[PDB]
Design a protein around this nucleic acid. Structure first.
Ligand SMILES: [Mg+2]
Ligand SMILES: [Mg+2]
Ligand SMILES: [Mg+2]
Ligand SMILES: [Mg+2]
Ligand SMILES: [Mg+2]
Ligand SMILES: [Mg+2]
Ligand SMILES: [Mg+2]
Ligand SMILES: [Mg+2]
Ligand SMILES: [Mg+2]
Ligand SMILES: [Mg+2]
Ligand SMILES: [Mg+2]
Ligand SMILES: [Mg+2]
Ligand SMILES: [Mg+2]
Ligand SMILES: [Mg+2]
Ligand SMILES: [Mg+2]
Ligand SMILES: [Mg+2]
Ligand SMILES: [Mg+2]
Ligand SMILES: [Mg+2]
Ligand SMILES: [Mg+2]
Ligand SMILES: [Mg+2]
Ligand SMILES: [Mg+2]
Ligand SMILES: [Mg+2]
Ligand SMILES: [Mg+2]
Ligand SMILES: [Mg+2]
Ligand SMILES: [Mg+2]
Ligand SMILES: [Mg+2]
Ligand SMILES: [Mg+2]
Ligand SMILES: [Mg+2]
Ligand SMILES: [Mg+2]
Ligand SMILES: [Mg+2]
Ligand SMILES: [Mg+2]
Ligand SMILES: [Mg+2]
Ligand SMILES: [Mg+2]
Ligand SMILES: [Mg+2]
Ligand SMILES: [Mg+2]
Ligand SMILES: [Mg+2]
Ligand SMILES: [Mg+2]
Ligand SMILES: [Mg+2]
Ligand SMILES: [Mg+2]
Ligand SMILES: [Mg+2]
Ligand SMILES: [Mg+2]
Ligand SMILES: [Mg+2]
Ligand SMILES: [Mg+2]
Ligand SMILES: [Mg+2]
Ligand SMILES: [Mg+2]
Ligand SMILES: [Mg+2]
Ligand SMILES: [Mg+2]
Ligand SMILES: [Mg+2]
Ligand SMILES: [Mg+2]
Ligand SMILES: [Mg+2]
Ligand SMILES: [Mg+2]
Ligand SMILES: [Mg+2]
Ligand SMILES: [Mg+2]
Ligand SMILES: [Mg+2]
Ligand SMILES: [Mg+2]
Ligand SMILES: [Mg+2]
Ligand SMILES: [Mg+2]
Ligand SMILES: [Mg+2]
Ligand SMILES: [Mg+2]
Ligand SMILES: [Mg+2]
Ligand SMILES: [Mg+2]
Ligand SMILES: [Mg+2]
Ligand SMILES: [Mg+2]
Ligand SMILES: [Mg+2]
Ligand SMILES: [Mg+2]
Ligand SMILES: [Mg+2]
Ligand SMILES: [Mg+2]
Ligand SMILES: [Mg+2]
Ligand SMILES: [Mg+2]
Ligand SMILES: [Mg+2]
Ligand SMILES: [Mg+2]
Ligand SMILES: [Mg+2]
Ligand SMILES: [Mg+2]
Ligand SMILES: [Mg+2]
Ligand SMILES: [Mg+2]
Ligand SMILES: [Mg+2]
Ligand SMILES: [Mg+2]
Ligand SMILES: [Mg+2]
Ligand SMILES: [Mg+2]
Ligand SMILES: [Mg+2]
Ligand SMILES: [Mg+2]
Ligand SMILES: [Mg+2]
Ligand SMILES: [Mg+2]
Ligand SMILES: [Mg+2]
Ligand SMILES: [Mg+2]
Ligand SMILES: [Mg+2]
Ligand SMILES: [Mg+2]
Ligand SMILES: [Mg+2]
Ligand SMILES: [Mg+2]
Ligand SMILES: [Mg+2]
Ligand SMILES: [Mg+2]
Ligand SMILES: [Mg+2]
Ligand SMILES: [Mg+2]
Ligand SMILES: [Mg+2]
Ligand SMILES: [Mg+2]
Ligand SMILES: [Mg+2]
Ligand SMILES: [Mg+2]
Ligand SMILES: [Mg+2]
Ligand SMILES: [Mg+2]
Ligand SMILES: [Mg+2]
Ligand SMILES: [Mg+2]
Ligand SMILES: [Mg+2]
Ligand SMILES: [Mg+2]
Ligand SMILES: [Mg+2]
Ligand SMILES: [Mg+2]
Ligand SMILES: [Mg+2]
Ligand SMILES: [Mg+2]
Ligand SMILES: [Mg+2]
Ligand SMILES: [Mg+2]
Ligand SMILES: [Mg+2]
Ligand SMILES: [Mg+2]
Ligand SMILES: [Mg+2]
Ligand SMILES: [Mg+2]
Ligand SMILES: [Mg+2]
Ligand SMILES: [Mg+2]
Length: 252
RNA sequence: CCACCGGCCCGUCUCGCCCGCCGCGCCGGGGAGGUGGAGCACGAGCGCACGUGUUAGGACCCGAAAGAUGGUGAACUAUGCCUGGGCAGGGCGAAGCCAGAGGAAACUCUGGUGGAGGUCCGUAGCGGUCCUGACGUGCAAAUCGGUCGUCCGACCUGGGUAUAGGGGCGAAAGACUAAUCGAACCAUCUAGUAGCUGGUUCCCUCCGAAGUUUCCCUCAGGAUAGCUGGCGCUCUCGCCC
RNA sequence: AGAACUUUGAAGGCCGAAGUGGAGAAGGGUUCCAUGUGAACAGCAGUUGAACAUGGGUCAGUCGGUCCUGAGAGAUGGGCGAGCGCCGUUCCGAAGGGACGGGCGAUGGCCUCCGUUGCCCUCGGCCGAUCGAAAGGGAGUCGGGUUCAGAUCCCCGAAUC
RNA sequence: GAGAGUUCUCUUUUCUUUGUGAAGGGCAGGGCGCCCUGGAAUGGGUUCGCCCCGAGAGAGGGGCCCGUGCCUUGGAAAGCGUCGCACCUUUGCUGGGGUCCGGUGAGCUCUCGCUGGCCCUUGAAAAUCCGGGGGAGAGGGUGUAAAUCUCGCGCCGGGCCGUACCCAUAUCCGCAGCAGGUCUCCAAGGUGAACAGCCUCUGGCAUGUUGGAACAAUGUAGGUAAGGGAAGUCGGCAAGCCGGAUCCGUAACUUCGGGAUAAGGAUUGGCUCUAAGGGCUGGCAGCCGACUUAGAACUGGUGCGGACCAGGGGAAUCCGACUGUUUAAUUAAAACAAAGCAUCGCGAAGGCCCGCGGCGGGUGUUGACGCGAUGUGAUUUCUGCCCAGUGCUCUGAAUGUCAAAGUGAAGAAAUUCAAUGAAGCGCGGGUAAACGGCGGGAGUAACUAUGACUCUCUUAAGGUAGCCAAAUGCCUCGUCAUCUAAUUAGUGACGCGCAUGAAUGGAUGAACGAGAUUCCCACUGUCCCUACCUACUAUCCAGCGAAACCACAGCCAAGGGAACGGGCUUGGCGGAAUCAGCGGGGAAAGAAGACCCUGUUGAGCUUGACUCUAGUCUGGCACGGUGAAGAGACAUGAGAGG
RNA sequence: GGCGAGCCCGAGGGGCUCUCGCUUCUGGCGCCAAGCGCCCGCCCGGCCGGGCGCGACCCGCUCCGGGGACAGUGCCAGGUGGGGAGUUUGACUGGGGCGGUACACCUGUCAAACGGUAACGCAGGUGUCCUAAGGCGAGCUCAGGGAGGACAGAAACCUCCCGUGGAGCAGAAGGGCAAAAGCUCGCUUGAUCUUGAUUUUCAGUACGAAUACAGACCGUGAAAGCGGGGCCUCACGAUCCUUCUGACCUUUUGGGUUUUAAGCAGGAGGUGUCAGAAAAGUUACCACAGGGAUAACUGGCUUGUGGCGGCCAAGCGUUCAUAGCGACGUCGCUUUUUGAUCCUUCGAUGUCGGCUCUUCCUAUCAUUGUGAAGCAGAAUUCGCCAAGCGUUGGAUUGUUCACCCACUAAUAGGGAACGUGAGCUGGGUUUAGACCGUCGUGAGACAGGUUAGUUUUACCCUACUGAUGAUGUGUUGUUGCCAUGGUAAUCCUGCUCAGUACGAGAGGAACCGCAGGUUCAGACAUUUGGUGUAUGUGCUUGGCUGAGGAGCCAAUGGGGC
């Protein structure tokens, strides 16, 4: 009869993201004439650590092509850039690490990251630390571009959206074991209040469909369909196949 | 007034025949027999008052576990966030560094330095294992004395702030949410219902029981019959039957 | 009048600086001080008291609030809602009323010269009103003396924003 | 130097005090990742530690910032101890000494600066203010003087609000002057490693809502006890032993880090000594002061951590890796959590959720090394077999069932019939680190049995590797061996194990458990077997003074009785009022039994119990408009076919 | 626009088709226009102050992109939906649940010679079957047995005889039936219509079943007659709704026709909890109103069971029934076991065991005095009067119980609300946490196992223990009796007896006497040991009084006496 923990997550009362010490949203520059009919050069001031994120944030200063003012943007620092390196943003920019340019111009097999789903989405895909997307196809007519995302999915996107070249800095971040609960607590304290993660079979039937019984067992098939109501989707959600995997999943 | 027989009216079943025409018809009316009616067969009701009995009203009085509506609480406690404060002393000795010795080389060994740890003894702080110690109408609606675990941390704490009741919060004890939490508090519905307990106030006189039949989701109950009381009413003795 | 509980002196002791000391914040609101009585309150008593009655006591440019935002709360634009209203805070808004300068015109002061008013031209992103800390940010006062009760406040002297 | 205390004896002795605020200037001191000359290796100068050098080291010469330190204006005339002249509601003023000479320090507190370490933790914004780049503009124009001044002065103003006191074992909350709770600063001397414990100074206090007399039992705290030493008890419960430091010695096991203060030994006082461990001045010598170590001699009735302070230990089993959290007010755990190991969904018109409402909100200042939902729970090795059933998922309008809406037909119409049929269901495949499961007979070894081996029914497969009378075994106090004089206990082994078993996790397993259990050593009043002593009661008195409970009240035996009387019957018998204990009775008090049953009385929870619903997936109707190509059916006239 | 690149024709050049402009070694700056061509007012054709355009091109109907007649929105329909909400969890019952239906209907007994009469009393049944197993009429007689006949046999078929029901009548039983109610044969649906009254449980209500009639149409036999189901006792169902049948019926609302609907009567579709709701489980997290109408304690009635005795005497006992046992049978006591019933207790009697302590019982283990043996002695066994005195120390278990070691004269059995929780302990049972095994999909359950889990109050009355007292003797004191009540002593070892009696030996006593010892009781401190604050004395740690001396403080500082 009581709302479960996974159901209380959507209320946003105490489960809000700790966004106090966040430096800024990681987004690219706005598409304009100086970007679609040439390129502009900017200077990287410094890279900083964003709490709750493994990818560093590089501050880049560009010169406004219309007003006398310097524009500061926060990009995702690709691995292999240093303070003082000139970063070029535009259509006819040279293919180098750090420079952003539309995917319709780069050749096949280009390892890029921080791209956009739609032209103007301003850097939404492949933003985690050490991830990249691989361009595999091109279409001159009916402009489309096939990319392979870090999840292995091959998605077709527009040929006008941009992507910075290179892999995100901070790779291999998951190779280190947390090695104790204190480091996990300090990690999740900057992200959000979701760490304790009490098992469902430990509590009572009032707070979870799995709790109860004199023996700490589930009693019901953990595989639950997609049509289950709120507060009922627990355990595996529409598990098409369970158990230890045998090779590659190869699912589209 | 009682019992019976017969008679009349209405609804039905059987049997057959007769009469009428503002129009000669799957139109009307009539008889003799058997049944059903809360009927007729010289009518007694109406209005007011009183008494008893049943019933609906909170309905002889007092009493729930619960349900709904609308509002108040995060000054305790649980959890986030923001902004501040605090944690005596000793023990073990991680990386790195220096020097010396051994060795053909690889390299090894030794003495220091170095000061890491969700490290150890231990104070303040934070909690409360045992004595199942004292109190147990107490200092106290949860305290006190020894003995305890941890004490650089997943640490303790102040103020501000967010989440409000089938909701919040929960390192999960269904624990906490203002001494109340397996669903808070406040007011109303509400004099909620109870086949269940308790109580139910002056005298005298007369009569005076039942715990049994049948039925009911009936077995701690009710209906029915029986037992009882009251109001009468219709007659009979009172002057060889 | 009344003495073990008040006062003074002496002796013997405790708290022994993580106090039984000196100050503060929250909270209390006159409890602080002086005088006076002793039925009630103080778990016995009382000449005593934080009780009673009367009268006093809190003085700031430089102590803090007032200013600023933090987590967060919040009106208008707009949307929803039968409705009190609610969600939403930059979203779907014609959401800058101010200024540098120049020109025209009017007015006032000793109309020499300046200060204003009305209009025209040029320029000007609010990161959206507003609230949110007596421990955060936040310019600038220290020494001595003074009362029965005040001290960085009162007086003297010396400074500063 | 001033004042004070002791002086039977000694002590130039002991105690209190001995000053410079904001602001401005100068000078010491500290820091520099700041400049110039010149460039090194035989590498250099440097820290407690690192660090730095051709991108310029050592050395020499300069600059900048803080200067809370020193002197000076303030500043000695105020302030404070001293000996005095008027004076006891007129009390001010005298003069001397205070701004005297110094030193040391792993000393405590505060501050400043340098450097290092910690990370899947990067540790706040805004208001005010300043500097720089740019050069739109303004200014007298010359032996007369303007544009501007962030320079030295001078004038004026700074409004409003709070300001006492407690801040506490007596001014706050807890019904109160309640051993309870409540956030901060300052904090000395001795012992001592220390803010441990104990004793004093500055400063407070009457012993915590009363005193007098006595020291009976019982009680509450405290300490000993001859001989035995756990023989008491369910249990070593409580109590008791060691407890600090220095010097030797430290096992099994292990993840090689630990175990570990393992275990087991020796010393510890007092007063005289010796040696070592430093700085400063001059061209190897002279003075100045801190307490540390080591050794030896002498000596006290073997006493020396002399009070206080303060780890019993070892051998094993079970569980949990550990640190951490947990039921405020009966549980601290084996429970929860934890890193680690796996699985599932999601590429944003998305996944999981909130919401009565909006293309409203959380994750999201987010993008697969992310988010959301589960299981197991250090490391190592292992992860066995079953998709039959219940769940999850995927596919072809070949294929059954199938609602509205739409089409055709019959009928005067309502209406009826028929054709087609979206999801879903049904069919088929996959998935068990999804829920779960893992049987039963018969014949066979030259002593025999048990049984190598084999045949057969069953459904989806018949317990593999492991482990055990376990926290899991009814029979059971299972059998064997050890531990004991004796063992329902403990350990090891045996294993058709009613009913162990593999992420329902199984087997191990160093360290750690205020976790449960067994044994051994020292230890003690737990005991044999009790006794004595101290403080506070209890006791009597002075003063003040309730509550629980109360049908009337209280001596027993037997009988009957509602089957256990105190009162009834028969007997025993029966003198007031009282004090201190006592706990046999009053079927004693605290509560309309939390146990069992009834109620056609409720609540929490679950599901393949009944009836519904948010939500979610599909189909139809409008928003919802234009063009091309193509498929199926209906009606039309005509040509082939059975 | 060529400061550019072209594929081409081509002598100069042209554009069919096109790339398009000028920021990529470097942690610097970059804005509020230079120039050019024109237009004004002021210095005689000049200076100063201003304005426009090009620089920086023109035109246009979405600000730029990505989807798009889809997605989404409103309405409707169908799936899924304990995520959420509401409600239910039959009754009887020797407590409840499980078991069973004694819940609806029959047969026999219970049932006591009318009818009626109960239990979870006994022995059994029913929810069907039959177009014949109904009706009529006729014919025949069955089960079994005896004697014969080819295969033929215990049983094949034929014939004779006996054959009162011993067979059959659909099925459980009872009653009934012989030219029959049984078997066979032939026609047949009277197993069809209609209105009443009556019988059975009965309230004399209904349903079901049944009886006798009456009114029409039929069957059958020739006929009298029989038949409106089964030879009789059971074989079955209200309201509302649905369906069917009949009128040449009634109403369909202002009046007509028709479809439809409603209406009358009787047949069916069911209430098996059967006089008829539509209904799963758990709560050890539990709550409320009650019940001793109703279990888990004790007590009380009986003792089946348990224990303890007696009688008979077949036999054991080498002989021999009864020294000692004593079967087959049978008669008694006990509530120290369990069980049966539920009488008091539900506004509570605190429910295991252990520790401490008192008293009682005897069915006597030992001790005192005795009798009998297969009692030579010793050691033993069976009884008598006999409860005065004892009936222990430990290992494991919560244990009652049970086993073991050792001691001992003996290590006997019990009662007092299964004595004793305002005396204690909390070891287990028996709350809430949690683990394992089994069961259940689940919540959860287990007289299955293992861990941690608040033990409250006396100051009242009585009883008991002790102390003041009271009554009466005129007052007081001293010395004295006891009526009454209590009552305390018990056991064992060593020596002489005595290596004697006895006994073939082995072995081996007893009375008197002498030393003692165990338990218990009364005291007592000379000696020994405890206690110790005479805070008695003398050392000693830290601090303090200036230092010696004398001292004090550290909750009686510690320790030697
Ligand atoms: Mg967990
Ligand atoms: Mg739980
Ligand atoms: Mg649930
Ligand atoms: Mg199961
Ligand atoms: Mg009421
Ligand atoms: Mg309800
Ligand atoms: Mg509400
Ligand atoms: Mg709070
Ligand atoms: Mg630690
Ligand atoms: Mg250790
Ligand atoms: Mg502590
Ligand atoms: Mg405590
Ligand atoms: Mg506590
Ligand atoms: Mg405990
Ligand atoms: Mg206690
Ligand atoms: Mg007490
Ligand atoms: Mg401790
Ligand atoms: Mg410890
Ligand atoms: Mg520790
Ligand atoms: Mg509700
Ligand atoms: Mg509470
Ligand atoms: Mg409610
Ligand atoms: Mg009432
Ligand atoms: Mg009845
Ligand atoms: Mg009558
Ligand atoms: Mg005094
Ligand atoms: Mg003192
Ligand atoms: Mg301090
Ligand atoms: Mg203090
Ligand atoms: Mg006074
Ligand atoms: Mg008083
Ligand atoms: Mg006062
Ligand atoms: Mg007053
Ligand atoms: Mg002033
Ligand atoms: Mg201020
Ligand atoms: Mg709002
Ligand atoms: Mg509006
Ligand atoms: Mg403000
Ligand atoms: Mg002053
Ligand atoms: Mg003051
Ligand atoms: Mg100064
Ligand atoms: Mg110093
Ligand atoms: Mg003040
Ligand atoms: Mg207090
Ligand atoms: Mg306190
Ligand atoms: Mg000190
Ligand atoms: Mg020292
Ligand atoms: Mg006193
Ligand atoms: Mg007090
Ligand atoms: Mg002793
Ligand atoms: Mg001794
Ligand atoms: Mg010993
Ligand atoms: Mg022992
Ligand atoms: Mg035991
Ligand atoms: Mg202990
Ligand atoms: Mg060993
Ligand atoms: Mg060890
Ligand atoms: Mg010397
Ligand atoms: Mg643990
Ligand atoms: Mg917590
Ligand atoms: Mg506890
Ligand atoms: Mg979203
Ligand atoms: Mg693991
Ligand atoms: Mg497996
Ligand atoms: Mg399959
Ligand atoms: Mg249609
Ligand atoms: Mg054989
Ligand atoms: Mg096996
Ligand atoms: Mg083992
Ligand atoms: Mg033992
Ligand atoms: Mg199993
Ligand atoms: Mg098994
Ligand atoms: Mg001792
Ligand atoms: Mg009596
Ligand atoms: Mg009795
Ligand atoms: Mg009696
Ligand atoms: Mg009584
Ligand atoms: Mg009487
Ligand atoms: Mg009487
Ligand atoms: Mg008394
Ligand atoms: Mg008592
Ligand atoms: Mg009751
Ligand atoms: Mg009932
Ligand atoms: Mg509840
Ligand atoms: Mg567009
Ligand atoms: Mg429900
Ligand atoms: Mg019942
Ligand atoms: Mg009779
Ligand atoms: Mg009869
Ligand atoms: Mg016949
Ligand atoms: Mg029969
Ligand atoms: Mg018969
Ligand atoms: Mg007839
Ligand atoms: Mg019935
Ligand atoms: Mg229920
Ligand atoms: Mg629970
Ligand atoms: Mg009864
Ligand atoms: Mg009973
Ligand atoms: Mg009681
Ligand atoms: Mg009692
Ligand atoms: Mg006796
Ligand atoms: Mg008892
Ligand atoms: Mg227990
Ligand atoms: Mg329990
Ligand atoms: Mg002889
Ligand atoms: Mg002889
Ligand atoms: Mg004695
Ligand atoms: Mg003596
Ligand atoms: Mg002595
Ligand atoms: Mg002494
Ligand atoms: Mg001394
Ligand atoms: Mg001395
Ligand atoms: Mg003290
Ligand atoms: Mg002593
Ligand atoms: Mg002694």
């Amino acid at each position: 009869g009581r709302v479960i923990r996974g159901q209380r997550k959507g209320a946003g009362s105490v489960f809000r993201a700790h966004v106090k010490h966040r430096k800024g949203a990681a987004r690219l520059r706005a598409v304009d004439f100086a970007e679609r009919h040439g390129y502009i050069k900017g200077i990287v001031k410094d890279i900083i650590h964003d709490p709750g994120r493994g990818a560093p944030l590089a501050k880049v200063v560009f010169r406004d092509p219309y007003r006398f003012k310097k524009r500061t943007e926060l990009f995702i620092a690709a691995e292999g850039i240093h303070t003082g390196q000139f970063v070029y943003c535009g259509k006819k920019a040279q293919l180098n690490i750090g420079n952003v340019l539309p995917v319709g111009t780069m050749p096949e097999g280009t390892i890029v990251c921080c791209l956009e789903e739609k032209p103007g989405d301003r850097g939404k895909l492949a933003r985690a630390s050490g991830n990249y997307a691989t361009v595999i196809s091109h279409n001159p007519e009916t402009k489309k571009t096939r990319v392979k995302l870090p999840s292995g999915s091959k998605k077709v996107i527009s040929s006008a959206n941009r992507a910075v070249v290179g892999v995100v800095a901070g790779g291999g971040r998951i190779d280190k074991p947390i090695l104790k609960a204190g480091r996990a607590y300090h990690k999740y304290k900057a992200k959000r209040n979701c760490w304790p993660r009490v098992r469902g079979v430990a509590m009572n039937p009032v707070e979870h469909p799995f709790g109860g019984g004199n023996h700490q067992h589930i009693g019901k098939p953990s595989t639950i369909r997609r049509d289950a109501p709120a507060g009922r989707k627990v355990g595996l959600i529409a598990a098409r196949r369970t158990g230890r995997l045998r090779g590659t999943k190869t699912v589209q």
